[PDB]
């Protein structure tokens, strides 16, 4: 028994129980009832990624229960972590693209009104999925088998660059520009709702995705044989659980904020 | 409406020929196009079919790979490229328009066509080929099919075509369901296997050859055709 | 199924594709309805935008296509057909300031300004225009200035107390028209003083439409 | 002659009319049909889900074959839906996008269109070129067109925003007959089975019966206290149902000239948009603004069925000629068929 | 003045003409409607549920 292991198990169980039904209901409402718009496409893709993550979570729960033991072939050991990485990177890129679109509809509203349609949304979603599948290639390649893991520096560097640094910087810049435009204009209304929502979203994203990348970077700068490396590898489970908690935090913070979507979800029950 | 065909004539065996068809008086992009060939002293035969927007194209099982049909919608034109012509391909081709919806009348207008001289499915079989009839009596042409055309929806897929010497074939019945532009004297009856086309009053303009066609599947097959002399 | 059924299915798919294309082509256009008692600024705004039932005009400004709508010819119960305009983007309500002294020919005891205020209040308090943006236009500035120089403003507003200044009177009228909107949170009023220069009016309309589109896009995403 | 004397005479005539109606009311439909067996609970399922509209649907009318149905939406296009194969037969592009009414000819060759535009468009479906073209345009009305129905391939009656109705001839193209008896905005129109009479309900809380060949009004009804929005003739031809914003349907007889019973409920307080009877007339279907459709018993006035398939206000409703099914269209851009 | 008087006279004449129409008992019309409904009950597919074989909409 280890307190970090129990904490990771509890966090993953809570994330699963709070994400699976909510994400399922949101996806069902957005697909069968909500009209097929661009934001509808974004919500559908995000809920699909979150549902895949939630359905793959029980595999991690069973792995933690077996305590590092995986009495299976190398096929699953190469498949399920690659699928987890694919889903996480797809969700991150979808959030980044949603932030980019919310910034573009304010920066160039006429261009969006004249060109932003469902076809471009589907194209950029396909490109996002392709990029995410390309990102999870070294995961599927370098994983080997009883302990399923690796046996790396450049991989972690490019992961931190493409998944954490650039998306977070882009989201921060987009939200800052949106707040500045809403607070500086001829018809600017005195309000702080959008600023509060942006601050909450940025804080949640940071709290979810900062410790994971921090520990991933520190893994290469710390000897695993030292007690510090042991503590890092132990709290890595808690960090990955907190990162997976973003899969459950994203629906409540993105889809369930629209008044029309809330009304549709309430009428659906 | 008008359908002007061009490109026919004498073609040496083994060559190529592009038959053109210009349509006017209607929406070319709304009607599906069909090619019907007719041999000298013989009956009709389906060649190829194209739909609106080139979304559905079908060819006859005998000319698969040789003929190529295309359509220009902004120009309202139809093109048919024929390569490696044999000594049997000498015939007269006609371009027909057909729209498919509830209450429609496919194969309603037949084009003038053009001549070209070189050098398991459902088949319609008629028992008679020539029936002498005098003015004053009635006409009743019977026909037997090898497969029951009565589909599950309940619609009878039987088309009657009256071709006159020198003129284009005119549609009489598209489904019992009388077509437009023809008198009520013509009528159709029978079961899903056997069919009977009756004429109330035989006039001097009803002479010609009657052909029967089935439309249960894409590959079409015309009958022998009954000729009436007066 | 038979070949005719497949042909009908293909035709239905083509019709659906055409409907989707037409919907995507019409979604880019912004719809602007017009309102106002009498003939205050109907012809003027129509002539500025151009340069028997419902009339509709199309014009492209700064790559934005506008769909003009006018209901000045419908002399019937407005409540029976106003719900059809629930999906409009903007509603331009035009009113003449010089009507502060003029009265309707139907009844001498009622003023035109009071009727315009009542119409504006009824349009703002409509259950179908809870989120529809309204742009207020004031017509005939020079005539209003001349009438103010000739006659005071208190003849129609007994509660008014101030100097006979064009700026002060315009600010008071703007505040009075803005106070009629009970939905200060969801409904925004765009006040503008229309003049002879149609370019400035078209630019202001474009800026207001841009702001409304930005606000709608932010509200749909749950951010605003 | 003085205006006060005319008002007094009109008041005396109204008093005589109401006294005659009270004295002639020897019984009521409730106590007469109380011994018949009840209808029971009725449940219907969504047989067809017609999608493709991108705006709020306003009108829908069935044809003689009970298979094709015309549908009108604010997108500015008419759609000919096929009931069995859920296919689109024709897509007619309209010049005026503010369409609120449509009609299907009994022969299936022509269609009507109208709405906020005073001009009523007539289109042909059996053109030789195979494409739907504008057959003609009818002008002369000052108000928005509310409803229109075909009597034959040459005549068509309709009502506009102004307090009048007009029956036009297709061959002539002018107003063949005019009816200026109503005092309010006419909003509902319903032809009789014999095609010689037709009922029209206006916003002044009144419905009037008018003859096609005669021209003058026969009877007047003032049973409603709100603007009448829907009306439908009874299959027998001796009665007609009316529905207004007071959340109460009322059946008025032509021979009795008096209301029979009121179809209302406690929790139902929203307006009514479309009412019609079945083939037998035992069931009365009514579309309400509460996103539901209520099927009442015409004899027992009890709630026989409830349909909650639509997510928006049901705007149009139509029962087939053979009574096989009933279609409903709401502002959610979806048509739903129940049976 | 003249238009209003003419409209009032027309309304009075219309109401007087409508008052001269004949009337019948309400019970007779109610019984007729009940008999019509009882007769056409067997011919109403909406009132009596038809089987799936005779139902064209039954998938
Ligand atoms: C994303 C993810 C999720 C994983 C699973 C899991 C593993 C195995 C099996 Cl059989 C089932 C589930 C898991 C989830 C929750 C918990 Cl509580 C424990 C395990 S593994 C994994 C991943 O891709 N790790 C990368 C980089 C992570 C390194 N550390 C950083 N970046 N901070 C890598 O392996 O290099």
Residue numbers in the entry:
A (entry chain A): 19 to 163, 170 to 175, 333 to 450
B (entry chain E): 1 to 119, 136 to 191, 193 to 247
C (entry chain B): 5 to 55, 182 to 354
D (entry chain C): 2 to 340
E (entry chain G): 5 to 63
Quote the study on this structure.
The alignment of transmembrane domains and similar TM6 positions among the structures indicate that JR14a-bound C3aR adopted an active conformation, further supporting that JR14a is an agonist. The activation mechanisms of C3aR induced by JR14a and C3a are nearly identical; both involve the same structural rearrangements in the DRY, NPxxY, CWxP, and PIF motifs, further confirming that JR14a functions as an activator of C3aR. JR14a binds to an amphipathic pocket similar to the C-terminal residues of C3a. Mutation of D4177.35, Y3936.51and R3405.42 to alanine directly abolished the activity of JR14a towards C3aR, whereas mutation of Y174ECL2 and R1614.64 to alanine had minimal impact. JR14a occupies a unique cavity within C3aR, resembling the binding mode of peptide agonists, but with an additional interaction site among TM1, TM2, and TM7. This distinctive binding pocket, not conserved in related complement receptors, accounts for JR14a’s selective activation of C3aR.
Activation of the complement cascade produces anaphylatoxins like C3a and C5a, which regulate inflammatory and immune responses via their respective G protein-coupled receptors (GPCRs). C3aR activation can induce chemotaxis of neutrophils and monocytes. However, only a few small-molecule ligands of C3aR, including SB290157, BR103 and JR14a, have been discovered. In summary, we resolved the first structure of C3aR binding to a small-molecule ligand JR14a, and clarified JR14a’s role as a C3aR agonist with both structural and functional evidence.
